Amino acid sequence: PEIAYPGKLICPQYGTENKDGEDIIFNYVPGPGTKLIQYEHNGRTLEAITATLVGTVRCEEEKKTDTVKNILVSVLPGTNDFANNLPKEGDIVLTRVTRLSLQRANVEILAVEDKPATFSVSQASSDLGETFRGIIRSQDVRSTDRDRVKVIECFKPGDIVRAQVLSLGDGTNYYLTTARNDLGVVFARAANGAGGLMYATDWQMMTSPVTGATEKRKCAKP
Amino acid sequence: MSVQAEIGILDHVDGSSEFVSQDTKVICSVTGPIEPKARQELPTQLALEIIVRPAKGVATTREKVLEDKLRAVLTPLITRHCYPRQLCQITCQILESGEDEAEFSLRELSCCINAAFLALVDAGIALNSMCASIPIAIIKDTSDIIVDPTAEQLKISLSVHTLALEFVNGGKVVKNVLLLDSNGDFNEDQLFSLLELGEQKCQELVTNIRRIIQDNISPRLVV
Amino acid sequence: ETIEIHPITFPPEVLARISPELSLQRHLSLGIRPCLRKYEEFRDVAIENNTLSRYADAGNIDTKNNILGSNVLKSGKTIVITSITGGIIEETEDIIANYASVYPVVEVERGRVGACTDEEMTISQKLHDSILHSRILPKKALKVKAGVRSANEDGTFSVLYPDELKRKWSYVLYAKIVVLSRTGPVFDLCWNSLMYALQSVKLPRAFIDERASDLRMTIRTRGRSATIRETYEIICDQTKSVPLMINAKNIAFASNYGIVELDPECQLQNLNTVLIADLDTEAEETSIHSTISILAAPSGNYKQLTLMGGGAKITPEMIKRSLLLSRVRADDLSTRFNI
Amino acid sequence: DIEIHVLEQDGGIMGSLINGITLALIDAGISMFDYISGISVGLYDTTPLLDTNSLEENAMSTVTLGVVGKSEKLSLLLVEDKIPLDRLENVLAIGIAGAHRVRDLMDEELRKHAQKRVSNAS
Amino acid sequence: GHMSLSVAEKSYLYDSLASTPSIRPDGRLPHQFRPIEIFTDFLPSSNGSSRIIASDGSECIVSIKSKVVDHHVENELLQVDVDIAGQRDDALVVETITSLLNKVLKSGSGVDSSKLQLTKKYSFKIFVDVLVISSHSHPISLISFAIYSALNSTYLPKLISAFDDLEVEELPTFHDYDMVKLDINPPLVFILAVVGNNMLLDPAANESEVANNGLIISWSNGKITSPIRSVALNDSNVKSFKPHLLKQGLAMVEKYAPDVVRSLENL
Amino acid sequence: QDRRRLLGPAAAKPMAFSNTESEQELSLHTGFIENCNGSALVEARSLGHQTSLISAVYGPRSIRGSFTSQGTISIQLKNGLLEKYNTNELKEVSSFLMGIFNSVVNLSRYPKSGIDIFVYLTYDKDLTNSQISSLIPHCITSITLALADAGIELVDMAGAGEANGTVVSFIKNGEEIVGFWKDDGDDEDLLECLDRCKEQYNRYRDLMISCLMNQ
Amino acid sequence: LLETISVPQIRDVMERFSVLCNSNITNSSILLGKILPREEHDIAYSKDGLPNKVKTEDIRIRAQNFKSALANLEDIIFEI
Amino acid sequence: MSTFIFPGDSFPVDPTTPVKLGPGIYCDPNTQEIRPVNTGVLHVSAKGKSGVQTAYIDYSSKRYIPSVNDFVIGVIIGTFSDSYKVSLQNFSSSVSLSYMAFPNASKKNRPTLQVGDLVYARVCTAEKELEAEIECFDSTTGRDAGFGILEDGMIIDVNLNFARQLLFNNDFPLLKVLAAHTKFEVAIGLNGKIWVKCEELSNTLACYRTIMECCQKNDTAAFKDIAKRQFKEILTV
Amino acid sequence: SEVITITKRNGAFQNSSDSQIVTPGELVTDDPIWMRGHGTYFLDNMTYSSVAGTVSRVNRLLSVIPLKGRYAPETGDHVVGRIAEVGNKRWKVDIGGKQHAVLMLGSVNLPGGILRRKSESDELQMRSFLKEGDLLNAEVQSLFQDGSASLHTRSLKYGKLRNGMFCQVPSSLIVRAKNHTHNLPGNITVVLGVNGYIWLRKTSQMDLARDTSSWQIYSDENDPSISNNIRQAICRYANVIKALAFCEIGITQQRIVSAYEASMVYSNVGELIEKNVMESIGSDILTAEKMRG
């Protein structure tokens, strides 16, 4: 698989070989960048893995602890883009708080996280509402005492909040959560950007070196 | 520099004014802070809605430039972080050009800056400092720098200038130059001679404005 | 309460998206800018003149083309395409009343659909005004020297043009400026492109039929009669053309500058006013509020200047340094492409 | 939402628009207090002309009247051309009387449509 | 599309339609149209008019007006104007159908423009105004039937003055009462639906929602003619189709169109 | 005249001028517009007609209007500098292009997202000392390049060809058809057009893959 | 479970795929080809006012250095 | 005669003295400097006030900005789960009034108020970047509440200065001049709203006309005499 | 063989026991004792109608029953609706009234039924259980102040619909009854919503057990094995319902089966959409009813 382009055939749905007097069955699974497409040829139909992206073809297989070998066929970019890595349920994202009212905290997705880090950045404009907007409900702010949560003491306008996707929600708002130790306000300035840089000293407290003023926030565990 | 202004002339607006220089008369109104449209909302700062209406005809792209330059002056003047997710409507209705509008927009812009500032003062909106704007022009045969030129002087000018300075400390310290809009043929020496004489007449204007503001507002307040 | 805390650091692309202001200050602490340039480094410029014009091949003049002059300009990552078309209208010192201008329509593509943005509308005005203010196009340079087409012997048509000497016509210049791949303040690129385009404009010869049959049109009132004056159809020559008379002494070139204060709490290990040349990237357009825009003529004349101080104070030193660089930039742009 | 399509026009289009909406609204079973009948009246010289067409409207001033039910109360009084102040009251009187006839015709046709439906349904 | 259906309803409909013996939800055959009603000559103000009513309540009104023009300066002698109620004039569907219809009824493509000529200089410009009151699917074929009916019952003013401008140059004058019937051959536009390997004439609303693709095929002078356009009836289930399907569609229209025209050209 | 543009004086009148098989070669470039996610430059020169068009893909971005399991695609053609086409005709091609790429773009991978594709008909010169039919295959080439450059998943490299007013777009090595267009032309010439267009489709697809890889 | 599909049946799949796969098996700029895809260059004016092309190489070197400076730079901070 | 100040002027008080900042005075988050941002009369409280001096600027304004512990007159305009949507002033951002806070409050128990009702309410919390909250009963009130519906009467628009003087200044003759003619109740809101009711409409109308005239002239002397002409004109019929 | 039926007409735009009737503004009575209900309005003693319909007198309650109008929800109605939108912890469903009905997350039987513990997660993930476009059975649990309906599906009888096809008739042609789900010959089952929304599906085991798996009560999947006859039966039944509706005659379980067997005269099914067959069919239904008396 030297090269990948949209529409190029990769492999059949199944494969096999002969090793040590035993036939090994390869079960190929359509991964990210590929798709099972049914073609016709010689009169008989055929389903084959087809690349849907432009890049280098990669495969992975795995058995975990919690004859047929399952192989995952995928296509990665060859050469940054927030296209192929659109925010899905379970993904962690970096978003900026746009507005606060008592009911909920609202942020617009700026970037997305990946497993061992690296980041994906949305090229959309925050000036034209081109960015995917999301909502952090008051009961999804933290894990303990979700009934009595003051939004004003958890987030502030302009704060950069690292959150995880709960659901796609509607077309307007994603639904996010920060009820983990590594989630919450990550980057912030005092007085909504009118002050100096604040770092997360305590998990619930933010401190600034020149300002001499401390503002409470639901910060990620340092 | 014999300008004349009135403050608080409109009833259904938070603040208003009427600035007059020569034949150039501009009336301005300011409402805010108020609830903003979703597309206007700024998470941390105040949103400015700036509108300029011409003396004749409807608003064109010309006034769109007047709105843009007026924005560059009013934006740093207002303490915007005091009003997050809020709106301030600023409308200027030019009543009389005082100049050939087909050729110049100098006097109308300066008068709009002074009027908008006065309207912001009347409305009681947080301002970081004070401000004054004057129109300046240069004549090729004369070689002179005329502050507050007439319409007839503009017709025979080689360059036209709008100068708006930011004043602090009782109108004695020039904090910054908010706007300098120089158009036409001019050299570096003319520019600084313009800025030197321009700063003087601007400082005189602030002093006059401070007088007008106190004369109108003080009767409203209590001792 | 003495404590030690460790910051969490985000990739430069991430940091630029998260906090443009911080991304700017981080770069400035290492003597560079978010666009990987140094404080006083400009973007290079590459142009191609008259490539879209009808007259681009003098040997093979296009017949189905109405472009009088054109310029394709790319500076850094931003692309500007300018084309000049024309029209004709009947007409009936160094003062501004004796100068004309072009009527530009600048369109910026950003993946949206709808009405004209405030950006596009304002870009057109400043271009129109600065052409009139810098006195590039005198009205005399647009006067149509109309010829006469008669039917000579052997059944042929010939056109006789006057030279160096009744109805009078004038040329009208229009401009379409398409801006692709916007990355920041784009006025300066539109102006420089327009200047290059104007220096390639060729005005088509115009003529009228010797004795067109169409004469006055009688219109009757309630008893009295009146005659509408005979309208002569002016026609442009398919091939012959004259170059546009531009006051080359007045052609200025555009450049912009910014001033920032270095924030001590943003330095990287390894007071002062900073002059930054040719603003690009979101980070610079968003966080730098003290800016300077100059149209400087190679003669060293300045067509226009703009001082917007919303951030750092504009000191005389910052102004002088900007004026110096504007001259140096203008000298480069004017002589580079031998237009 | 009320959508109207004017397929053909020949004077008194405003009055016809009023009658069309009143009928359609009733057909939709939407509650209303009373009928609103529309009519136009021209004034050629002294004379008053009920229900004028395009030719008459081009040759004289017309008055468009909307009358609520059988009453003397006007929902719409529309005068777009010059009318002597002395003639206006009489013109109104003609229009109101004519509009009442329009109401009767609308009411008649409506009961007819109703009655048949009742007969066939029950 | 217009109609909203659940995933289950779509799956049932698709399987039913994609079956080798294609089963339509109303029991129709792959070439059977639904009953329509057509009214003509009800607009005396116009030269011609029609009104078509479908079985699903879809309604379209066509008007035909004429104007004397100089055919030396007026290239297009037949202008189609489409107005779909509830849609902007600059809507995507409106302009597309407008552009399409104008090509279907071009002066020198699918219309005998000779019958519009008055003199050596002047000719009759025909304005075909379309008004779609209601529609639940692609109304292109609905409008086509109405335009056909309207153009076959159109009456134009008769010329009196001489027909040689070049020399005598007489001003175009017409008779006070007599009108000559517009003899012309209006083309028809058929729309097909592609569900699996089956092709259906006159796709219903629910049918179009599950269709894989669609075809717009024009018809004039007893033969297939341009414009021919493939069209996505919906946008959620659009798939590529084998070339034989395209040839099947053209063949299907080629044999069932005269039947439609026969029922439409009734005296 | 217009209060949003400078169109000049109204008494002015535009300047009007007076009088006194073939092989095709194209040039391809991608990713030169930083403003968007994907872009392409397609230039073709043949006989007495050359065309230079630019495509730009913006997406996947946020959709206000409705919830969606799959993605939504919009295509808009814009007139260029000199050559002009009817807005209706540009809308019609846009609709024809939407149908094609709704069969190619893997919409399932982009829930509640919008992919807005712009094609600028920048420079279309007519040098002959419905012309829109000859531009259609070049549009599909540009959009395919731009989408692939953007990183939008495609089932297959969609290409097309034109022959005597007939335009047909192919996928899957020309086995199937994703779009069929026919204006004017002749009668019973379907088979000849399909073969000629498939030849252009094959040539365009090879150059596209060559561009997406080597460049 | 997977006993149902044969190795032999799958083998045929490899064959038909090889059949399908086997069966499947210069640029010049006319007008805007030259200027539109122009590589980004930068210039730096010296004291004499002469334009100097920044090295294509230079841009990369600063970027590597900038990346280094932040990563090493980020770690240490004391608050009192 | 007073000591007027303008934005960008030097602040008289020295940093060596602890100063509580009120309206008009701004503390820059970046440069830590204290500077005036409003135009008017500077008022500085005398020393000895628990070691803390309060400095503020009295400036002319009519656009209300919610601050904690303010008595305001709102109009119900909306229904939201868990509270009322109430508007202090036209075109201003809405404020919230919880169902929980009422004179004989119960979580089960609910308010009978219907959109369009006037409420005499106290603004307990006013976050700058968050919707204003208005409560009828306050903990500060400590079991005494004047809060609730205003029935009938007439409401009057008034600039913030005139309303502040009417609520906190006892030397303001307006209430007295209106008491020497008729007896009626009045609610005063710091958001520039004044509610007036009498037994007869003619008296309420007369009060309405007086308050507007007195608010317009701002001449303290005028009202007793100005009021006299107003009372007379009503009986003119 | 006939390609199409076109009906033509020229020179015209369009073709052209006693029950009390009244129009808006008409005086119904002058007895002030009456309690004025819907369709009326009053001034002192005079009571006027607020719509075009028949005067109704029940006890002392004078009201005017309108001729025309949308389906009006009553508490306890069996309706068929389509999910219009999903927000918060509720489902908004299109019934066919003035407003969308609401369907709170609480009412519906969640997967695993009673045994599963109540979950915070489900509110976020509800779209998966239900989404825009889905059809379902529901009962009008309660009514809002304006008249809007709150729905519930807290039953095995109610839930997501599948294995069939949708069609709708005017709500006036379907009245309230003891039960709206009926079994018909051809192994198909009809669901006659009071709102006029009708669902025709293949008879399931539940439909049989009504007169004689809890994890898959919201699955979109149609039954894998659905015979053509069942499909061709559905098409036939659906057409006859449209035929009954075309006659403006209210549907009956008996009328449907009667029409279904009577329609067997016609070989091809696609021959049930034509008006003549409907007109003749309608008369057939009605004459029999008259005979029954």
Side-chain angles (χ1 to χ4, degrees), chain B residues 29-78:
Chain B
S29 68
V30 163
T31 302
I34 58 175
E35 177 72 28
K37 295 183 177 299
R39 55 171 185 84
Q40 297 175 329
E41 290 188 8
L42 300 182
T44 70
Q45 310 181 40
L46 175 71
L48 291 317
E49 179 175 347
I50 303 174
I51 311 168
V52 170
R53 294 293 183 85
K56 300 175 184 177
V58 302
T60 62
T61 56
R62 171 177 178 264
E63 290 75 23
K64 219 61 185 174
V65 163
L66 290 182
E67 291 173 4
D68 190 90
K69 296 181 179 176
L70 183 57
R71 177 174 296 269
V73 178
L74 300 184
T75 304
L77 279 177
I78 310 177

Side-chain angles (χ1 to χ4, degrees), chain F residues 47 71 115 176 181:
Chain F
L47 177 63
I115 305 177
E176 297 177 355
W181 181 289

Side-chain angles (χ1 to χ4, degrees), chain F residues 153-173:
Chain F
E153 298 192 7
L154 297 182
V155 174
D156 194 23
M157 296 270 86
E162 185 274 338
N164 195 22
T166 298
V167 183
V168 175
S169 186
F170 299 97
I171 60 169
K172 289 179 168 58
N173 289 284

Side-chain angles (χ1 to χ4, degrees), chain B residues 11 13-14 32-35 81-82 84 86 121 124 127-130 168-170 210 213 219-223, chain H residues 4 6-10 26 35 37-41 58-63 65 91 93 128 161 165 218:
Chain B
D11 303 336
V13 188
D14 294 334
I34 58 175
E35 177 72 28
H81 280 90
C82 183
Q86 294 300 320
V121 170
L127 301 177
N128 299 324
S129 45
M130 294 196 65
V168 290
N169 192 31
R210 289 172 66 99
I213 295 184
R220 310 182 194 175
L221 308 177
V222 77
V223 294
Chain H
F4 214 66
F6 298 83
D9 288 17
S10 178
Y26 182 77
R35 55 179 221 265
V37 293
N38 283 112
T39 59
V41 180
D58 182 28
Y59 62 95
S60 178
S61 176
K62 56 200 302 181
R63 179 61 55 179
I65 302 175
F91 324 119
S93 300
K128 189 183 57 179
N161 304 94
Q165 282 286 325
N218 192 31

Side-chain angles (χ1 to χ4, degrees), chain A residues 89-93 162-166 175-178 180 183:
Chain A
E89 170 181 348
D91 296 332
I92 305 180
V93 175
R162 181 179 180 274
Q164 187 181 17
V165 181
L166 290 174
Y175 281 88
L176 314 177
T177 182
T178 49
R180 294 183 181 277
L183 300 181

Side-chain angles (χ1 to χ4, degrees), chain E residues 4-9 11-12 16 23-24 26-27 32-33 35-41 51 259-260 263 266, chain I residues 3-13 15 82 133 135 164 166 220 222 228 231 235 239 270 274:
Chain E
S4 181
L5 299 175
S6 63
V7 184
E9 295 176 72
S11 178
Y12 179 86
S16 190
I23 308 178
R24 295 239 214 177
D26 61 333
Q32 294 300 140
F33 286 70
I36 64 179
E37 300 184 0
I38 299 189
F39 301 86
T40 51
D41 194 35
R51 171 178 187 247
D259 289 345
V260 174
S263 301
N266 192 31
Chain I
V3 175
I4 186 167
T5 305
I6 305 173
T7 307
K8 283 177 287 292
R9 175 75 156 87
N10 305 331
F13 186 80
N15 289 337
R82 187 180 305 276
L135 276 183
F166 171 84
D220 289 345
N222 289 284
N228 296 266
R231 293 186 177 274
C235 299
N239 289 337
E274 300 303 340

Side-chain angles (χ1 to χ4, degrees), chain C residues 7-59 61-109 111 113-139 141-152 155-157 159-164 166-219 221-223 225-228 230-269 273-278:
Chain C
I8 294 169
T9 189
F10 305 88
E13 293 177 350
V14 179
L15 180 66
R17 297 294 181 192
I18 290 308
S19 183
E21 293 177 350
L22 186 63
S23 182
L24 175 59
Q25 294 290 339
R26 287 283 193 265
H27 286 85
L28 295 178
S29 64
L30 301 183
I32 69 176
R33 296 160 54 181
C35 58
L36 302 177
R37 283 148 53 197
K38 183 178 179 180
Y39 299 162
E40 293 187 352
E41 288 181 345
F42 288 79
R43 292 177 294 184
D44 191 34
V45 158
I47 79 170
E48 289 191 17
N49 274 24
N50 192 31
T51 64
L52 313 180
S53 173
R54 51 154 43 203
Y55 308 95
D57 197 333
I61 298 181
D62 296 332
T63 57
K64 301 181 180 180
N65 193 336
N66 192 211
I67 300 179
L68 308 180
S70 68
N71 168 264
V72 180
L73 158 63
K74 183 172 188 179
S75 181
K77 289 140 58 179
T78 303
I79 300 177
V80 179
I81 301 179
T82 304
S83 61
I84 310 293
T85 55
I88 302 184
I89 183 181
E90 294 205 11
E91 213 74 35
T92 304
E93 300 81 9
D94 197 24
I95 65 178
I96 204 178
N98 300 333
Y99 293 85
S101 177
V102 313
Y103 299 95
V105 177
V106 59
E107 293 177 350
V108 181
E109 302 288 340
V113 280
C116 296
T117 64
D118 285 17
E119 181 185 28
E120 296 168 0
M121 286 170 61
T122 51
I123 289 193
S124 305
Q125 262 294 330
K126 296 163 187 174
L127 287 180
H128 173 269
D129 296 332
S130 295
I131 285 190
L132 188 24
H133 276 150
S134 52
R135 296 134 214 269
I136 309 291
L137 273 172
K139 291 189 176 66
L142 294 183
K143 286 182 172 55
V144 175
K145 308 182 185 305
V148 284
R149 182 172 69 176
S150 301
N152 296 22
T156 185
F157 294 158
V159 184
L160 181 65
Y161 297 104
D163 191 339
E164 201 175 26
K166 193 187 182 304
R167 289 174 166 85
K168 286 180 294 184
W169 299 266
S170 299
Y171 290 109
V172 180
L173 301 178
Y174 309 103
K176 174 158 293 183
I177 301 177
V178 296
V179 173
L180 275 66
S181 185
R182 185 192 188 280
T183 48
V186 84
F187 166 81
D188 302 86
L189 299 182
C190 292
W191 173 267
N192 296 334
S193 177
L194 181 53
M195 289 302 102
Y196 287 142
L198 285 188
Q199 298 181 24
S200 178
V201 169
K202 298 178 181 179
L203 302 175
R205 285 277 195 172
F207 58 87
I208 57 182
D209 287 321
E210 178 191 12
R211 288 142 61 182
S213 58
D214 295 89
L215 62 80
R216 282 209 169 193
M217 181 175 61
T218 57
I219 312 297
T221 299
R222 47 174 183 269
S225 181
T227 60
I228 296 186
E230 46 187 359
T231 303
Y232 288 162
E233 295 85 357
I234 184 68
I235 305 296
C236 294
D237 190 276
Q238 180 64 219
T239 298
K240 309 185 82 298
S241 65
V242 295
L244 183 57
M245 287 301 101
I246 296 288
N247 297 17
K249 313 160 304 307
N250 292 329
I251 302 176
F253 284 94
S255 63
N256 77 92
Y257 308 91
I259 296 91
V260 286
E261 295 184 6
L262 293 179
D263 193 28
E265 183 178 2
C266 298
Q267 303 181 9
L268 295 174
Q269 151 157 343
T273 299
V274 175
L275 189 62
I276 299 299
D278 190 26

Side-chain angles (χ1 to χ4, degrees), chain G residues 41-46 48-54:
Chain G
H41 290 292
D42 300 327
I43 61 178
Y45 293 90
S46 301
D48 44 27
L50 298 179
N52 300 118
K53 172 185 176 180
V54 177

